[PDB]
Each structure stands twice: as structure tokens, then as C-alpha cells.
């Protein structure tokens, strides 16, 4: 049956070519479920224009040589030129998957999306987060996450008290 407190709407979108960003996204949606949300996971360029005007939208994306992943291109283009259909009401947050090994393009797509979303009417509830695959990606991912839940916590409602291990959900043989 579970306990289903919040149940607030958390939509998590990813831009991924090799699955790092996609697994991070699905991980987030898994911890949201533990924090009573009503999470939804999908690619970025599939909600192109259909940003949620309620709850919040976590945006997890990589960069490829300064460009969006194959499942995120439609989103960004829609975001870049198209601005008319303003992004007002959309309370979001952005997590960046990047590699320091990519010099001048480091986290360019997450950054683009983050700041572009804001120069269009942002409800940026939680400052962007970055992961460097070339160092401590789980540290930063961890920092951004804990800070993140709280930012959105205080913002709206107050569902999990300590995950209350709504986590340990082994299943084995």
C-alpha cells in the first residue's frame, strides 16, 4: 500500500546519450517516491513546451561537445529561439552531467537550459548542480541532492522525514 504523502508532482526530464544522466534522473525519481512525490520520468525533448505549471521539474542532462544529447535537442531549440510561450509558473532545478576533459564546453548544455529558463520567467527553487565524471561525480551529485530536497521542501510541503528509509528496498535470493 505504501504511504503516499507528496503527494506533490515531481517531473524528472533527462537529456542522455549514454545513460549517465538518464540513470541519475531515474534515481531521483526513485528517491522522490520515497519522499511521497508523484514523480514522472521522461526525456527532455518530449516535454518541449509542456513544462509543468505545477509542482516542480528536475532537469538532468549531459553535454556533447557543447551540444544537447540526441533526446534533448528539440527541447533546447524550442527553448533557444522559442521564448514566446513563456516558462512562467514552471518551478524547476537543473543537474549537470559533464566531464572536465571537455575544456571550453564544460556543462554548457545544463548551464544554457538553467539560465535560459530564467531569462523567460524562472521559479528556480534550487540552484543548479554539476557532476564531473573526471573526479567526484557522486560527491557533487550528493551535495546538490540533499540541498535540493530541502529547497523544494521548505518551498511547498514537508513529506519525508529522513527518507525514513523509504529506501532500503532490497529484493534478492
Amino acid at each position: 500500500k505504501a504511504e503516499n504523502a507528496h503527494n506533490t508532482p515531481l517531473l524528472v526530464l533527462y537529456g542522455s546519450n549514454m545513460g549517465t544522466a538518464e540513470g541519475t534522473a531515474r534515481d531521483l525519481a526513485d528517491i522522490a517516491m520515497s519522499k511521497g512525490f508523484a514523480p514522472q520520468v521522461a526525456t527532455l525533448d518530449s516535454h518541449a513546451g509542456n513544462l509543468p505549471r505545477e509542482g516542480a521539474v528536475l532537469i538532468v542532462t549531459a553535454s556533447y561537445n557543447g551540444h544537447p544529447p540526441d533526446n534533448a535537442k528539440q527541447f533546447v531549440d524550442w527553448l533557444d529561439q522559442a521564448s514566446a510561450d513563456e516558462v512562467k509558473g514552471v518551478r524547476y532545478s537543473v543537474f549537470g552531467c559533464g566531464d572536465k576533459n571537455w575544456a571550453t564546453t564544460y556543462q554548457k548544455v545544463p548551464a544554457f537550459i538553467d539560465e535560459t529558463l530564467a531569462a523567460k520567467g524562472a521559479e528556480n527553487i534550487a540552484d543548479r548542480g554539476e557532476a564531473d565524471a573526471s573526479d567526484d561525480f557522486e560527491g557533487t551529485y550528493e551535495e546538490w541532492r540533499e540541498h535540493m530536497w530541502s529547497d523544494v521542501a521548505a518551498y511547498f510541503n514537508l513529506d519525508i522525514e529522513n527518507s525514513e528509509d523509504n529506501k532500503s528496498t532490497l529484493s534478492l535470493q
Partner: protein, 403 residues
């Protein structure tokens, strides 16, 4: 007797098919302290490939590391057992089936750094109070970066360090990540044999940065130990960044590919050689190759020297460790040749780099830009914009790795 292979999930996720090794041999010289392997693989009717494609290899964990696990848990390799959870599992384990320990152990990564979830699980089963304090110390941001991630300290090495951590096998296996494929740059051209592909594999080996004995890279040592007639599970992968020869064989090429970086250029060389044999004319093609020594790791020397003799390439070598010579790297040679290389790029050459992406590629890139700046008397910013434009025209391609 479907002598058949697990079609483990990942093999299905990558479209990896099962197939035979037709050749496997050493490329370095007798007495080299290091190894680089050349493997030839057969492909089934349904598969096909192109120059600059990668072979995706689903590897197996070697015996040494499997035995370390069964020893730590006091288990026999052949002990049949059955798992179960109810909960999802990126760890892509056969659940509700009976399967030996040793075969369960071919589904998981055994030497990824220890994760924070893994550390907590161990702490919770530890009845050594000071040992629990230490495992928890490792959870802190700084310690985790410096002692876990920097040294690639694994769960397995910590279980060996802590024999009275009461974690059990079935909890171990379930906390591990699913086994990942490894990519290798196909080193042959399909213009020579459409149904046969080669790879060129540097063998990872050294003292473990964690301090626990000797380290062996999983796929590379798996590949190194295969022999003619063995089977192998793989798939063809095409990279998002195109890495192919120009459409016109008179368009000039510059290739930089030291060490195993030569791999994809061996395919380029084989392609050009067939095009010639079909009456096509070939333009200039410079191959910058670097290694320690011709007495050690000058991979495919004979082939590359023959290619050069048949006018398929012009070969430029750099040796880091020849007695009585300066330590030389490809970028030093490139820099001597700056004028010529930049004129070529002004006439429409493609430039390619393959091999090490962490140190070699950036230094090669810096030398190319500096050659530009010096030849055309422009700023470093103009030289950077030039390279940016070259890449956007599709004329500056990388097949580099941190591995």
C-alpha cells in the same frame, strides 16, 4: 547441443551476438614489460561495420578476482543458489532461477570504487567497533574523494580488509553494479573482409592504486587471455562523432595516433590500400605514431612500413625512451612539421586524433593551434576559432579515451 551463451541482459541491450575469436596474438616485443593484443573476430551475417566503428565487448571477470570473492565468503564456485528481492535491479541478475556462484559473479562489476550505499551496508554488519568507525569515516566528503575515489578502493578490498564484517554473499552480489561493456576501436577495414574485424587492446595491469596487491583491468585481461576458437560476446557500436575517411581519396589526411591510438588508423590504411588496388588515386596521408621504442611497442611496424613503401601513407615516428636520443612525442614532431601540416589543412586536409584523451590529445591540439598562430601570424584566440571552425566543418575528429 546448443552449445549456447548466456544472453545476459546487457548482451541483449547492446545487440551483442556471440561469435568466435579467429586470432589472438601479442603485439609488443619479447621482453617488453607490457602487453598490447591483437584480436581478430568473426562476425555473423546480420552484423556489419565501417571504419571508425567500435566493438562493444561484454567481458568476463577473471579467475583470480572471482576466487577472491568465493574465498571471502567461504563458498565453492559451483555452489548452485537462487536469489530474490521484489525491488528493481539495474544489477541485471537472474532472480528466481538457480545458478552457480561463479556464474552469478559474471553479471557484476567487482572493481568499481566502493559506493556510499555499499559503505553503509558494510558498516551496519560490522561488529568490530573501531572498524565501524573507520568505514563511516569514509563517508565524509573529503575522505570519500581522497581515499575512496582517488585510489579506486573497492567493496571487495574492504571486505578482505574486514573479515568480521558479517555481510553475506547474497547481499554483496545485490549491492553491485551490472557488468558494463568495454569499447574498442576496430582496427581493420571492411573493404578487406566484411565479416571479420580486428581490435587492438592495451592490457591494463599494475600495482593497485588502492594498495591491495596487483590490479588487472577487467575487459583488457579477459581479451588478452582469449585464444583461437574461444567465443566472445560483442556488438558493433557507431560513435555519435563520425570518424571516417573523406569521401574523396585525394583529400589529404593527418592522423595522430600513438600507442594503441594507431588502432583506427590501421583500418584507414587498409581502406586506402584497397582503393588504390581498385585504381583510385590517393593524396597525401601523414601518420604520426609514437611509442617507447622500436625494441618494445612499435605496433604494426611491418605493416605501416609496407604501407609507406606502397605510397599509402607517410610515416612519422616519435620515441620516448631510445638510449642517447631526447624523449620525443608526436607533438614535437608535429611542431617541426607545422608549416607543412598547416598548408595541408589550408588545402582541405582532415585531421584525426586517436588514443589517450587525457594528456596526449590536449597537447596535440595545443601544438596544432600554436603552429597555426605562428604560420599565419595571428593570435591564440584566432587560432582557437580556426580550430573551432575546422571541427564544425567536420574536419577535425577525435577517437580518444581515458582508457
Amino acid at each position: 547441443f546448443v552449445d549456447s551463451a548466456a544472453d545476459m541482459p546487457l548482451a541483449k541491450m547492446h545487440g551483442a551476438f556471440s561469435t568466435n575469436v579467429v586470432a589472438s596474438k601479442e603485439l609488443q616485443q619479447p621482453g617488453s614489460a607490457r602487453s598490447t593484443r591483437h584480436l581478430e573476430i568473426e562476425l555473423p551475417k546480420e552484423a556489419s561495420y565501417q571504419e571508425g566503428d567500435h566493438l562493444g565487448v561484454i567481458p568476463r571477470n577473471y579467475e583470480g578476482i572471482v576466487n577472491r570473492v568465493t574465498a571471502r565468503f567461504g563458498l565453492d564456485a559451483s555452489q548452485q543458489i537462487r536469489l530474490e528481492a521484489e525491488e528493481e535491479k539495474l544489477a541485471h541478475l537472474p532472480l528466481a532461477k538457480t545458478v552457480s556462484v561463479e556464474e552469478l559473479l559474471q553479471y557484476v562489476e567487482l572493481q568499481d570504487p566502493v559506493t556510499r550505499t555499499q559503505l553503509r551496508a558494510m558498516a551496519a554488519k560490522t561488529v568490530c567497533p573501531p572498524h565501524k568507525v573507520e568505514l563511516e569515516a569514509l563517508l565524509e566528503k573529503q575522505a570519500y574523494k581522497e581515499q575512496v575515489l582517488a585510489k579506486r578502493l573497492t567493496m571487495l578490498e574492504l571486505l578482505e580488509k574486514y573479515p568480521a564484517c558479517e555481510m553475506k554473499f547474497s547481499e554483496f552480489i545485490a549491492l553491485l553494479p551490472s557488468i558494463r561493456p568495454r569499447y574498442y576501436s576496430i582496427s581493420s577495414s571492411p573493404r578487406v573482409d566484411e565479416k571479420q574485424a580486428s581490435i587492438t587492446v592495451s592490457v591494463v595491469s599494475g600495482e593497485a592504486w588502492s594498495g591491495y596487491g596487483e590490479y588487472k583491468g577487467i575487459a583488457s585481461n579477459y581479451l588478452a587471455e582469449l585464444q583461437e576458437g574461444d567465443t566472445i560476446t560483442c556488438f558493433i557500436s557507431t560513435p555519435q562523432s563520425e570518424f571516417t575517411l573523406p569521401k574523396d581519396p585525394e583529400t589529404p589526411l593527418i592522423m595522430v595516433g600513438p600507442g594503441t591510438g594507431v588502432a583506427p588508423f590501421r583500418g584507414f590504411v587498409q581502406a586506402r590500400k584497397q582503393l588504390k588496388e581498385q585504381g583510385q588515386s590517393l593524396g597525401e596521408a601523414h601518420l604520426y605514431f609514437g611509442c617507447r621504442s622500436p625494441h618494445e611497442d612499435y605496433l604494426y611496424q611491418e605493416e605501416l612500413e609496407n604501407a609507406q613503401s606502397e605510397g599509402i601513407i607517410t610515416l612519422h615516428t616519435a620515441f620516448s625512451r631510445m638510449p642517447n636520443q631526447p624523449k620525443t612525442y608526436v607533438q614535437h614532431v608535429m611542431e617541426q612539421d607545422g608549416k607543412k601540416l598547416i598548408e595541408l589543412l589550408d588545402q582541405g586536409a582532415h585531421f584525426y586524433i586517436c588514443g589517450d584523451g587525457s594528456q596526449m590529445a590536449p597537447a596535440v591540439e595545443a601544438t596544432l593551434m600554436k603552429s597555426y598562430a605562428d604560420v599565419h601570424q595571428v593570435s591564440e584566440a584566432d587560432a582557437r576559432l580556426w580550430l573551432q571552425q575546422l571541427e564544425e566543418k567536420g574536419r577535425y575528429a577525435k577517437d580518444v579515451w581515458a582508457g
